[PDB]
């Protein structure tokens, strides 16, 4: 069902597929998708967490994770290298084309909203 | 910049794969070409996939700990048994294996080594019945001072090594006659120990002499420090002295004035090097006890063996023999895959040999690439004649200009310009470096030279970063008391440093640390010190 | 299946049940459980986000949300009042006693780990 | 402190419900007792559940906007039709409904009001054919200065109001004879307008005169400000003047020297009050256009009606009539539930009336509670005789001590001590307040007095906080340009302030703001100013 999500850009999931694929759309963030046990992990990168963020910004960051946020189920986190990341988790079975299309959009929405909060710091 | 771990939706228009990925059916351009079995597959959309045999085994990394180095000759046999001991050019050991690789680099044959380890497994166990800059040059300067010259271990090693090296010299009387060698063996017979400087110098002549790298991690001020003994940092220091020093579990700092920890983390021994391309130049056999070279790729190269009598020690020299036996044949049936965005990119990734192999087999594919390689190799000599004859009298004369013109003409795609710059950066090539050092900071007519110069500064910047990782971060990161908050900060400074391309970015790394590290002083001082120096 | 999760403390889901129940165990954090469409939401409170947090602390906070964290699937967020919250989402059907017992423990583990990072600020 | 939004596991030992929750079968202690239908259920584990009819309708909140206040008489009829207009004691309106509630509080009968609105729906539409401290006392001080005395609207309202009030006075000639009233109607007949001070003063005598609260939100410096006209803040200012001022859409600031926005958010009109217990004292009928009193509980009390001719305006006076008709009967069949941890707690939540009702019906249940209530009401008088006779001559004489002793004896559980303190805090009770003001900051022998005093300071602190919310936060929070980051910060300062129990905590609220607000100056100044003042 991922392969038919791909299909709509005339891309096909590459044979001998290993860990990480990376999609770069014509506008906006690159999409990194690792592969899991029974699902793919979509992720969008926002840069290394900046030093000296103001409280309000910290808050707006944390608030992205309320179970009620407009971006659900996308989550905001940092990886072990301190890189600020939005991610979601697409399962095989459960999810499908329309649903993956949603994840993707919520990731881009999250990325555009936040990305100016860091840079100007 | 990758991620490390351990209502109708408005459409997204057209989206490519950011990396190259083969799409559609593949033809095979060249099947198994050469010693390294080069396979090129090419896809409908251009993307060329390279498959190639694992690189040559040229290195042996020996991890320390315990006393269990009576298993070690298991491997040593397994190596000459399958006959790839010749092929080794480097040996690297920490703590307990620090001694062992000394012995071996010195040139001690497989059988020779064993009998010694059967009077050594007493000694290695009886030594357990016994038991600005940094903490590296203040060791490097504390050696000639107030340290007891030669102990039972120093003596025994001094001689083991001196026998092997002197013995090989003779079996190869073609080299013995060469001034520099005969200078070294008159030193050795005078009572002097083998240094790194010469272990190195001898490995160029005889292939049964290996280079040596002994790593070790000393606690100071609760803060573990990396310390290296090798041909480059401690050239004339004696191999014996070091292997003993790094025998010191945690060792005394003389009190000179102004998983666990005994492990030097594996990757701190394996060497950082700047390969002209995406191809790894060699493999490691990593023996362990209990181009970011990742966990996963390091696992693949690591075999991990599972009051001592004399027969259980044999058992161990058999278990090892056998695992280091299956590995070596298996490793022979595994591969490397590299994906490129064009044929020419993948022909660029091959050294001249490999290129020449593909050429023998399928000349229709490579004629362009061989044409280009030939002209580059010509222009690079032509440029070297210029540089040298100019020393005859800095100033780019016409002859250099002409060769830089010939190189500029070959760089008709961004891929080849990159290749031509890297070629001109070989640290090993004194004459090219002579020229880059001179045009440092300058604006130059030639694009290739402009690339090469930029490439040079990138590298300058990377070694600085690497130096800082090793001496500001590494010590704090593995301080035992370290709260996770603090660890997060530094694991991030490491990330900053890894990707640092300019001095300014390096400054910012350190400031992130000054501004945000809770003494919950020294790391912060340390950083301040790096930040002010050029 | 929630009612049998309760049952093990000799508590029973109260009749005329409305929005929010609150469980206070003998040691450790109070557990707030709202009720949803087809599931309950467990939540643990950590206080209002402090002013002037150091970067490393911010980082350790964000790192709680990596899909690989030892606390998964518990998430860290702030509510609209700026209150720092760990929460998980228990669905009817899917989850059961053993599973709810896990959520709970991961919440308490998260709360003890983090709670000293804020106070001393 | 609640959350607002819009490997084997080691066991957790024994866990209670942090709130009280009935467990097991319930008996019913008292079924439908009294006018307010008191039901008490009690459970196996003690927990007592109270169910009780929705509080008395005592308030009318009229939201502004548009010109559509020709629908308004729909409700007015619906009120006297079902006959609960008498029962109203308060009226509160903003913007366009600000005028309307003026008219009504003035005492204008239902039928009277309509004919006026049928020559008003011209006027209300022709005025749309026309179209330290804060911005509150600098209005409160700008009124007597350079403002045109009486316009067509001011005159018409001045008279409408003056007719109603003077008319009621006569229908009730028992009050007309009372000095203070006859003082007010000789003012009114002299040409003076009705103030709040007297609308208030008259609502105590006659029940068809209502109090008035007109709220409005003025932009200054892009920053909306709350402004209130009521009996307490602007007592002698005229009702007419205000209702017109708050007719001003956005209105000019004379340039005096040193969802959408027209909405005053509903809850900024409804009053904060300190009820002795968890019981709400009244209900609101909230008419809208298009003990944290939550969204959900406010929805329940809000009915929301869905160049103007004269027959479509009738239609609107019918649609409203009918919805405000179904509501009022429905609201009559709905309830309130309150859960307590013990019987006595729930008998404490009842006023003396309600108590007395339950007592009539089931005296076995309440005898203890009536015993306690009787003794408290006695001791509280006994204490008041003391306070007063002491003014005869500050110093707690023996007589106060004795009564404080009698009260201390009644506080034999933490629940009752809380009740006894709150009782002694009634702002309305001048004599008790006389004593709390005097023992302010003092350490006192009596526990009850010690509670009461602590309770007093908590309240002092809450009004300060509320004042700050209204004048540092509210303006920034609803600044149109406000980036969400900034909004997050203040939505948090609000939270801090809500829960603030001591001046020190209030200071911290403001510092969070000073330290973390990005001018992306004034809010920050504003806060600084609050932080330094006592």
Tab-separated table of N, CA, C and O in Angstrom, chain B residues 175-264:
chain	number	residue	atom	x	y	z
B	175	UNK	N	67.389	-6.326	1.053
B	175	UNK	CA	67.105	-5.069	1.770
B	175	UNK	C	68.187	-4.715	2.784
B	175	UNK	O	68.532	-3.548	2.957
B	176	UNK	N	68.707	-5.733	3.455
B	176	UNK	CA	69.757	-5.558	4.443
B	176	UNK	C	70.895	-4.655	3.934
B	176	UNK	O	71.527	-3.927	4.710
B	177	UNK	N	71.130	-4.695	2.623
B	177	UNK	CA	72.240	-3.966	1.991
B	177	UNK	C	71.940	-2.483	1.824
B	177	UNK	O	72.848	-1.691	1.545
B	178	UNK	N	70.667	-2.115	1.943
B	178	UNK	CA	70.278	-0.721	1.795
B	178	UNK	C	70.626	0.094	3.035
B	178	UNK	O	70.145	-0.204	4.126
B	179	UNK	N	71.483	1.124	2.863
B	179	UNK	CA	71.901	2.080	3.885
B	179	UNK	C	70.926	2.231	5.055
B	179	UNK	O	71.268	1.896	6.178
B	180	UNK	N	69.718	2.712	4.788
B	180	UNK	CA	68.772	3.040	5.864
B	180	UNK	C	68.415	1.827	6.750
B	180	UNK	O	68.309	1.947	7.979
B	181	UNK	N	68.250	0.667	6.121
B	181	UNK	CA	68.016	-0.578	6.844
B	181	UNK	C	69.237	-0.950	7.698
B	181	UNK	O	69.110	-1.232	8.892
B	182	UNK	N	70.415	-0.947	7.075
B	182	UNK	CA	71.651	-1.299	7.756
B	182	UNK	C	71.994	-0.286	8.849
B	182	UNK	O	72.792	-0.572	9.739
B	183	UNK	N	71.382	0.894	8.775
B	183	UNK	CA	71.465	1.886	9.847
B	183	UNK	C	70.602	1.442	11.028
B	183	UNK	O	70.983	1.638	12.186
B	184	UNK	N	69.454	0.827	10.726
B	184	UNK	CA	68.487	0.427	11.746
B	184	UNK	C	68.907	-0.823	12.503
B	184	UNK	O	68.648	-0.933	13.689
B	185	UNK	N	69.555	-1.757	11.816
B	185	UNK	CA	69.941	-3.026	12.424
B	185	UNK	C	71.262	-2.927	13.188
B	185	UNK	O	71.580	-3.778	14.023
B	186	UNK	N	72.041	-1.896	12.898
B	186	UNK	CA	73.200	-1.589	13.730
B	186	UNK	C	72.769	-0.866	15.008
B	186	UNK	O	73.393	-1.017	16.053
B	187	UNK	N	71.673	-0.113	14.933
B	187	UNK	CA	71.032	0.379	16.144
B	187	UNK	C	70.507	-0.786	16.985
B	187	UNK	O	70.826	-0.891	18.171
B	188	UNK	N	69.751	-1.685	16.359
B	188	UNK	CA	69.103	-2.765	17.096
B	188	UNK	C	70.107	-3.663	17.821
B	188	UNK	O	69.934	-3.955	19.009
B	189	UNK	N	71.183	-4.036	17.127
B	189	UNK	CA	72.233	-4.880	17.696
B	189	UNK	C	73.041	-4.207	18.812
B	189	UNK	O	73.577	-4.887	19.683
B	190	UNK	N	73.140	-2.871	18.754
B	190	UNK	CA	73.700	-2.012	19.844
B	190	UNK	C	72.942	-2.041	21.184
B	190	UNK	O	73.427	-1.496	22.178
B	191	UNK	N	71.740	-2.621	21.192
B	191	UNK	CA	70.974	-2.795	22.415
B	191	UNK	C	69.693	-1.995	22.416
B	191	UNK	O	68.884	-2.125	23.338
B	192	UNK	N	69.504	-1.178	21.378
B	192	UNK	CA	68.282	-0.358	21.218
B	192	UNK	C	67.032	-1.193	20.887
B	192	UNK	O	67.117	-2.234	20.216
B	193	UNK	N	65.877	-0.731	21.363
B	193	UNK	CA	64.596	-1.379	21.059
B	193	UNK	C	64.020	-0.923	19.726
B	193	UNK	O	64.442	0.103	19.171
B	194	UNK	N	63.061	-1.681	19.201
B	194	UNK	CA	62.383	-1.248	17.986
B	194	UNK	C	61.403	-0.104	18.269
B	194	UNK	O	60.634	-0.144	19.227
B	195	UNK	N	61.498	0.941	17.459
B	195	UNK	CA	60.614	2.084	17.553
B	195	UNK	C	59.403	1.864	16.640
B	195	UNK	O	59.293	0.823	15.987
B	196	UNK	N	58.480	2.819	16.611
B	196	UNK	CA	57.467	2.821	15.569
B	196	UNK	C	58.105	3.288	14.255
B	196	UNK	O	57.930	2.654	13.199
B	197	UNK	N	58.885	4.369	14.342
B	197	UNK	CA	59.513	4.982	13.173
B	197	UNK	C	60.090	3.962	12.206
B	197	UNK	O	60.026	4.132	10.980
B	198	UNK	N	60.638	2.887	12.753
B	198	UNK	CA	61.329	1.922	11.928
B	198	UNK	C	60.471	0.703	11.597
B	198	UNK	O	60.595	0.130	10.508
B	199	UNK	N	59.604	0.308	12.529
B	199	UNK	CA	58.594	-0.687	12.216
B	199	UNK	C	57.909	-0.246	10.944
B	199	UNK	O	57.802	-1.004	9.981
B	200	UNK	N	57.525	1.019	10.925
B	200	UNK	CA	57.046	1.666	9.725
B	200	UNK	C	58.060	1.540	8.584
B	200	UNK	O	57.769	0.950	7.537
B	201	UNK	N	59.256	2.075	8.801
B	201	UNK	CA	60.262	2.136	7.749
B	201	UNK	C	60.595	0.773	7.142
B	201	UNK	O	60.954	0.683	5.967
B	202	UNK	N	60.427	-0.283	7.937
B	202	UNK	CA	60.700	-1.652	7.498
B	202	UNK	C	59.541	-2.325	6.758
B	202	UNK	O	59.767	-3.147	5.865
B	203	UNK	N	58.311	-1.951	7.102
B	203	UNK	CA	57.122	-2.471	6.415
B	203	UNK	C	57.032	-2.085	4.931
B	203	UNK	O	56.339	-2.752	4.155
B	204	UNK	N	57.736	-1.026	4.537
B	204	UNK	CA	57.855	-0.675	3.119
B	204	UNK	C	58.743	-1.642	2.329
B	204	UNK	O	58.483	-1.912	1.150
B	205	UNK	N	59.801	-2.143	2.973
B	205	UNK	CA	60.677	-3.140	2.361
B	205	UNK	C	60.065	-4.529	2.489
B	205	UNK	O	59.634	-5.119	1.502
B	206	UNK	N	60.028	-5.047	3.714
B	206	UNK	CA	59.571	-6.414	3.957
B	206	UNK	C	58.104	-6.391	4.351
B	206	UNK	O	57.716	-5.578	5.187
B	207	UNK	N	57.284	-7.281	3.746
B	207	UNK	CA	55.834	-7.369	4.033
B	207	UNK	C	55.426	-8.212	5.267
B	207	UNK	O	54.241	-8.323	5.553
B	208	UNK	N	56.391	-8.799	5.975
B	208	UNK	CA	56.100	-9.514	7.225
B	208	UNK	C	56.361	-8.627	8.435
B	208	UNK	O	56.141	-9.025	9.593
B	209	UNK	N	56.858	-7.428	8.172
B	209	UNK	CA	56.849	-6.390	9.193
B	209	UNK	C	55.672	-5.433	9.026
B	209	UNK	O	55.399	-4.897	7.933
B	210	UNK	N	54.977	-5.246	10.140
B	210	UNK	CA	53.762	-4.491	10.174
B	210	UNK	C	53.961	-3.219	10.995
B	210	UNK	O	54.852	-3.146	11.826
B	211	UNK	N	53.165	-2.196	10.685
B	211	UNK	CA	53.082	-0.968	11.489
B	211	UNK	C	52.336	-1.225	12.789
B	211	UNK	O	51.671	-2.253	12.940
B	212	UNK	N	52.442	-0.299	13.734
B	212	UNK	CA	51.803	-0.506	15.017
B	212	UNK	C	51.112	0.738	15.500
B	212	UNK	O	51.623	1.866	15.329
B	213	UNK	N	49.925	0.518	16.058
B	213	UNK	CA	49.164	1.554	16.715
B	213	UNK	C	48.704	0.967	18.024
B	213	UNK	O	47.952	-0.016	18.042
B	214	UNK	N	49.164	1.548	19.128
B	214	UNK	CA	48.678	1.136	20.431
B	214	UNK	C	47.898	2.265	21.058
B	214	UNK	O	48.440	3.347	21.302
B	215	UNK	N	46.614	2.018	21.291
B	215	UNK	CA	45.750	3.022	21.915
B	215	UNK	C	45.562	2.662	23.387
B	215	UNK	O	45.786	1.507	23.774
B	216	UNK	N	45.210	3.661	24.201
B	216	UNK	CA	44.970	3.465	25.628
B	216	UNK	C	44.223	4.649	26.204
B	216	UNK	O	44.321	5.750	25.682
B	217	UNK	N	43.485	4.431	27.289
B	217	UNK	CA	42.621	5.468	27.851
B	217	UNK	C	42.933	5.748	29.324
B	217	UNK	O	42.545	4.972	30.193
B	218	UNK	N	43.612	6.857	29.611
B	218	UNK	CA	44.027	7.147	30.993
B	218	UNK	C	43.055	8.075	31.673
B	218	UNK	O	42.736	9.130	31.135
B	219	UNK	N	42.586	7.677	32.856
B	219	UNK	CA	41.853	8.579	33.753
B	219	UNK	C	42.772	9.669	34.228
B	219	UNK	O	43.838	9.389	34.748
B	220	UNK	N	42.391	10.922	34.008
B	220	UNK	CA	42.860	12.006	34.857
B	220	UNK	C	41.703	12.867	35.323
B	220	UNK	O	40.840	13.242	34.527
B	221	UNK	N	41.698	13.201	36.610
B	221	UNK	CA	40.697	14.110	37.144
B	221	UNK	C	39.316	13.521	36.860
B	221	UNK	O	38.422	14.208	36.351
B	222	UNK	N	39.166	12.229	37.150
B	222	UNK	CA	37.953	11.481	36.798
B	222	UNK	C	37.631	11.420	35.305
B	222	UNK	O	36.674	10.751	34.905
B	223	UNK	N	38.437	12.104	34.485
B	223	UNK	CA	38.123	12.316	33.078
B	223	UNK	C	39.038	11.511	32.177
B	223	UNK	O	40.201	11.853	32.004
B	224	UNK	N	38.502	10.444	31.571
B	224	UNK	CA	39.299	9.563	30.714
B	224	UNK	C	39.849	10.333	29.553
B	224	UNK	O	39.187	11.218	29.046
B	225	UNK	N	41.067	10.014	29.145
B	225	UNK	CA	41.711	10.731	28.068
B	225	UNK	C	42.196	9.717	27.071
B	225	UNK	O	42.663	8.645	27.460
B	226	UNK	N	42.061	10.025	25.786
B	226	UNK	CA	42.660	9.181	24.762
B	226	UNK	C	44.145	9.464	24.643
B	226	UNK	O	44.573	10.626	24.718
B	227	UNK	N	44.924	8.395	24.476
B	227	UNK	CA	46.381	8.483	24.285
B	227	UNK	C	46.837	7.527	23.172
B	227	UNK	O	46.511	6.328	23.182
B	228	UNK	N	47.575	8.058	22.204
B	228	UNK	CA	48.003	7.237	21.072
B	228	UNK	C	49.516	7.149	20.935
B	228	UNK	O	50.242	8.157	21.030
B	229	UNK	N	49.970	5.913	20.745
B	229	UNK	CA	51.320	5.626	20.320
B	229	UNK	C	51.273	5.058	18.920
B	229	UNK	O	50.713	3.972	18.685
B	230	UNK	N	51.802	5.833	17.982
B	230	UNK	CA	51.997	5.357	16.626
B	230	UNK	C	53.148	6.055	15.914
B	230	UNK	O	53.777	6.967	16.464
B	231	UNK	N	53.399	5.612	14.682
B	231	UNK	CA	54.495	6.089	13.846
B	231	UNK	C	54.520	7.594	13.712
B	231	UNK	O	55.584	8.171	13.522
B	232	UNK	N	53.350	8.232	13.776
B	232	UNK	CA	53.260	9.669	13.505
B	232	UNK	C	53.398	10.563	14.753
B	232	UNK	O	54.004	11.630	14.688
B	233	UNK	N	52.889	10.101	15.888
B	233	UNK	CA	52.891	10.916	17.097
B	233	UNK	C	54.052	10.638	17.996
B	233	UNK	O	54.550	11.539	18.684
B	234	UNK	N	54.493	9.387	18.017
B	234	UNK	CA	55.566	8.986	18.916
B	234	UNK	C	56.591	8.121	18.172
B	234	UNK	O	56.786	6.955	18.514
B	235	UNK	N	57.284	8.711	17.182
B	235	UNK	CA	57.948	7.940	16.144
B	235	UNK	C	59.164	7.199	16.658
B	235	UNK	O	59.450	6.091	16.206
B	236	UNK	N	59.872	7.814	17.598
B	236	UNK	CA	61.169	7.312	18.020
B	236	UNK	C	61.092	6.691	19.404
B	236	UNK	O	62.043	6.049	19.861
B	237	UNK	N	59.954	6.879	20.071
B	237	UNK	CA	59.661	6.127	21.279
B	237	UNK	C	59.643	4.643	20.948
B	237	UNK	O	59.281	4.247	19.842
B	238	UNK	N	60.048	3.829	21.910
B	238	UNK	CA	60.174	2.400	21.704
B	238	UNK	C	58.858	1.646	21.889
B	238	UNK	O	58.169	1.805	22.888
B	239	UNK	N	58.583	0.758	20.945
B	239	UNK	CA	57.398	-0.105	20.950
B	239	UNK	C	57.193	-0.841	22.253
B	239	UNK	O	56.078	-1.044	22.685
B	240	UNK	N	58.281	-1.267	22.857
B	240	UNK	CA	58.215	-1.986	24.127
B	240	UNK	C	57.659	-1.094	25.236
B	240	UNK	O	56.801	-1.520	26.010
B	241	UNK	N	58.145	0.143	25.295
B	241	UNK	CA	57.829	1.029	26.399
B	241	UNK	C	56.331	1.231	26.447
B	241	UNK	O	55.686	1.047	27.491
B	242	UNK	N	55.794	1.570	25.281
B	242	UNK	CA	54.400	1.903	25.111
B	242	UNK	C	53.475	0.740	25.487
B	242	UNK	O	52.561	0.910	26.292
B	243	UNK	N	53.731	-0.439	24.921
B	243	UNK	CA	52.861	-1.599	25.116
B	243	UNK	C	52.720	-1.942	26.591
B	243	UNK	O	51.683	-2.467	27.014
B	244	UNK	N	53.771	-1.628	27.360
B	244	UNK	CA	53.779	-1.754	28.820
B	244	UNK	C	53.033	-0.634	29.465
B	244	UNK	O	52.278	-0.851	30.416
B	245	UNK	N	53.261	0.587	28.991
B	245	UNK	CA	52.562	1.726	29.561
B	245	UNK	C	51.077	1.440	29.463
B	245	UNK	O	50.367	1.498	30.466
B	246	UNK	N	50.637	1.042	28.268
B	246	UNK	CA	49.243	0.685	28.036
B	246	UNK	C	48.872	-0.697	28.597
B	246	UNK	O	47.749	-1.168	28.424
B	247	UNK	N	49.824	-1.341	29.267
B	247	UNK	CA	49.519	-2.459	30.166
B	247	UNK	C	48.945	-1.959	31.482
B	247	UNK	O	48.215	-2.679	32.163
B	248	UNK	N	49.260	-0.710	31.821
B	248	UNK	CA	48.805	-0.092	33.063
B	248	UNK	C	47.273	0.131	33.096
B	248	UNK	O	46.742	1.062	32.464
B	249	UNK	N	46.595	-0.742	33.852
B	249	UNK	CA	45.116	-0.809	33.971
B	249	UNK	C	44.421	0.587	34.036
B	249	UNK	O	44.041	1.134	32.992
B	250	UNK	N	44.196	1.130	35.259
B	250	UNK	CA	44.418	2.576	35.409
B	250	UNK	C	45.814	2.855	35.997
B	250	UNK	O	46.198	2.230	36.996
B	251	UNK	N	46.561	3.777	35.374
B	251	UNK	CA	47.975	4.007	35.720
B	251	UNK	C	48.280	5.351	36.366
B	251	UNK	O	47.618	6.351	36.076
B	252	UNK	N	49.302	5.374	37.231
B	252	UNK	CA	49.666	6.583	37.997
B	252	UNK	C	50.125	7.739	37.096
B	252	UNK	O	50.824	7.524	36.097
B	253	UNK	N	49.717	8.961	37.449
B	253	UNK	CA	50.172	10.156	36.738
B	253	UNK	C	51.368	10.843	37.408
B	253	UNK	O	51.559	12.058	37.272
B	254	UNK	N	52.175	10.049	38.118
B	254	UNK	CA	53.410	10.522	38.737
B	254	UNK	C	53.142	11.732	39.631
B	254	UNK	O	54.000	12.137	40.414
B	255	UNK	N	51.931	12.275	39.529
B	255	UNK	CA	51.559	13.506	40.219
B	255	UNK	C	52.354	14.703	39.696
B	255	UNK	O	52.724	15.594	40.460
B	256	UNK	N	52.613	14.713	38.389
B	256	UNK	CA	53.295	15.839	37.741
B	256	UNK	C	52.436	17.116	37.765
B	256	UNK	O	51.215	17.062	37.556
B	257	UNK	N	53.077	18.256	38.026
B	257	UNK	CA	52.351	19.514	38.234
B	257	UNK	C	52.208	20.357	36.955
B	257	UNK	O	52.827	20.062	35.927
B	258	UNK	N	51.393	21.410	37.045
B	258	UNK	CA	50.976	22.212	35.887
B	258	UNK	C	52.122	23.073	35.332
B	258	UNK	O	52.318	24.220	35.754
B	259	UNK	N	28.331	-2.085	28.914
B	259	UNK	CA	29.765	-1.825	28.621
B	259	UNK	C	30.456	-1.143	29.816
B	259	UNK	O	29.792	-0.595	30.717
B	260	UNK	N	31.793	-1.175	29.819
B	260	UNK	CA	32.609	-0.593	30.916
B	260	UNK	C	33.568	0.503	30.401
B	260	UNK	O	33.338	1.076	29.327
B	261	UNK	N	34.635	0.786	31.163
B	261	UNK	CA	35.515	1.931	30.873
B	261	UNK	C	36.877	1.547	30.334
B	261	UNK	O	37.470	2.301	29.554
B	262	UNK	N	37.393	0.387	30.754
B	262	UNK	CA	38.703	-0.100	30.280
B	262	UNK	C	38.740	-0.167	28.753
B	262	UNK	O	39.812	-0.146	28.134
B	263	UNK	N	37.557	-0.223	28.154
B	263	UNK	CA	37.444	-0.189	26.717
B	263	UNK	C	37.747	1.180	26.128
B	263	UNK	O	37.122	2.184	26.485
B	264	UNK	N	38.759	1.208	25.267
B	264	UNK	CA	38.865	2.218	24.232
B	264	UNK	C	37.786	1.863	23.216
B	264	UNK	O	37.858	0.811	22.582
